C-alpha cells in the first residue's frame, strides 16, 4: 500500500523536453537522447525509516543520485545526501528536495535552460522557494 511514487524503475525527464532522458555523463548528470540503455533507467526505492526516497542507477545499482560540494548532482555510494523528499505537483511531475537543509534552506534538483533548451547542461542543486520554478520540475515515468 503506497500510491505515492511506488518502488520500481523510472525514466527521469525534465519538464522542458519529452525526448531527453537523465543519465550519467562522466561524473555529471545530464539529459540526453533516448539510448534504451540501463544508465537511463533509475530504481526508485522508499526508505520507511528515514521517510524519503533513494534513487539508484540500473547500470550501476550501488550508486545513488547524490550531490557534491560544488553544487552538482552526482552518482555515488549511499549517504544522507542521497535522501530525497519529492513533492508531486502534477501527474508524474515532481520537485526533488534534499531531505536535509542545505545551507539552512530547502535545496532541489535544478536544470538550467536556454529558451527551454537543456542540452549539455548538468543537473545542479539549488535553493527552492515554491512550486512555480520550471527548472526544478521533473517527470518520473515508469517503467
Amino acid at each position: 500500500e503506497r500510491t505515492f511514487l511506488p518502488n520500481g524503475n523510472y525514466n527521469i525527464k525534465s519538464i522542458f523536453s519529452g525526448s531527453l532522458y537523465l543519465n550519467p555523463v562522466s561524473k555529471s548528470l545530464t539529459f540526453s537522447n533516448e539510448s534504451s540503455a540501463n544508465n537511463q533507467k533509475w530504481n526508485v526505492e522508499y526508505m520507511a525509516e528515514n521517510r524519503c526516497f533513494k534513487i539508484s542507477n540500473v547500470a550501476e545499482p550501488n550508486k545513488y543520485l547524490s550531490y557534491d560540494n560544488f553544487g552538482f548532482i552526482s552518482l555515488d555510494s549511499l549517504s544522507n545526501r542521497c535522501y530525497w523528499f519529492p513533492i508531486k505537483i502534477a501527474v508524474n511531475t515532481y520537485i526533488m528536495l534534499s531531505l536535509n537543509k542545505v545551507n539552512e534552506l530547502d535545496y532541489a534538483w535544478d536544470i538550467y535552460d536556454t529558451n527551454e533548451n537543456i542540452l549539455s547542461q548538468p543537473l545542479l542543486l539549488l535553493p527552492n522557494f515554491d512550486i512555480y520554478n520550471s527548472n526544478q520540475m521533473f517527470k518520473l515515468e515508469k517503467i
Binding site: 528515514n50 544522507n80 536535509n100 537543509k101 530547502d106 522557494f129 515554491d130
Partner: protein, 212 residues
C-alpha cells in the same frame, strides 16, 4: 464551537496568508455570526501573525514561524452577532508549531581536553564530549545526537585506540598500546549528528594526553 487541532510547520516559504482552518459556531444558523481572535500572535504581540476572516471564520497565518523562538501560540476565538452580544463563550485555541530539523548539533567546546593512564585496560573511561541540538526533543529525532569518531592523529600504533559511546559522548580506551614516550598526544575528530546520526552533523576536537 467546531474547532479541530490546529498546527503549522515552521519555515513556510511563502503563499502567505496561508489558510489553517475555517472555524465556526454551530449556532450560525440562528443569526449572522462575526468571528474574531485575541491573544499573543493575534491582537497582542507579536501582532498579526494569525488573522481570521470575520464573516467566514477562516483562520490564517501571515508569516513564517520558528518553533525555537515560539513553539506554541495561545489564542482565544470569539463568536458574536451584529449587536455585539456573544453567541458562544470565548474558546481557547492552541496552535502548535511543527518542528523541522533546521538546527545543527553544537558541541559545547571547539576542543575538549582529556588524559589517560599509560597502561589502562580497554573499557577504561577517558573523557566525555557533549553537544546540544535546539530542535524538538519530545516529538522528533531532530535532536537525537549520535557521537562518532571521524579520525585519529596519529594513526599509531593502531587506527582505533579509542571508542566513543554514540549516546553519551563518553570516550573510552579501545586497544592496548598507549606509550607515553612514543605517542604522548592524540587528536580525535569527533562528530555529532542528529536524526540518530543520519541528519545534520558537526565536528570538534578531542585532544588526549597520554601520561604516567
Amino acid at each position: 464551537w467546531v474547532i479541530p487541532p490546529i498546527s503549522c510547520p515552521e519555515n513556510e516559504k511563502g503563499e502567505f496568508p496561508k489558510n489553517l482552518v475555517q472555524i465556526k459556531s454551530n449556532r450560525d444558523k440562528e443569526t449572522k455570526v462575526f468571528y474574531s481572535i485575541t491573544g499573543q500572535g493575534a491582537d497582542k504581540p507579536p501582532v498579526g501573525v494569525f488573522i481570521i476572516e470575520r464573516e467566514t471564520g477562516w483562520l490564517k497565518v501571515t508569516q513564517p514561524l520558528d518553533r525555537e523562538a515560539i513553539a506554541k501560540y495561545i489564542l482565544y476565538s470569539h463568536a458574536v452577532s451584529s449587536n455585539g452580544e456573544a453567541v458562544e463563550d470565548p474558546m481557547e485555541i492552541v496552535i502548535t508549531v511543527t518542528d523541522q530539523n533546521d538546527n545543527r548539533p553544537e558541541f559545547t567546546q571547539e576542543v575538549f581536553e582529556g588524559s589517560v593512564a599509560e597502561g589502562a585496560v580497554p573499557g577504561t573511561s577517558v573523557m566525555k564530549v557533549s553537544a546540544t541540538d535546539a530542535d524538538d526533543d519530545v516529538n522528533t529525532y531532530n535532536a537525537a545526537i549520535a557521537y562518532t569518531i571521524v579520525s585519529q592523529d596519529p594513526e599509531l600504533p593502531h587506527k582505533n585506540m579509542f571508542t566513543v559511546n554514540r549516546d553519551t559522548g563518553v570516550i573510552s580506551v579501545l586497544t592496548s598500546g598507549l606509550d607515553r614516550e612514543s605517542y604522548p598526544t592524540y587528536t580525535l575528530v569527533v562528530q555529532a549528528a542528529d536524526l540518530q546520526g543520519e541528519g545534520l552533523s558537526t565536528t570538534a576536537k578531542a585532544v588526549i594526553t597520554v601520561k604516567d
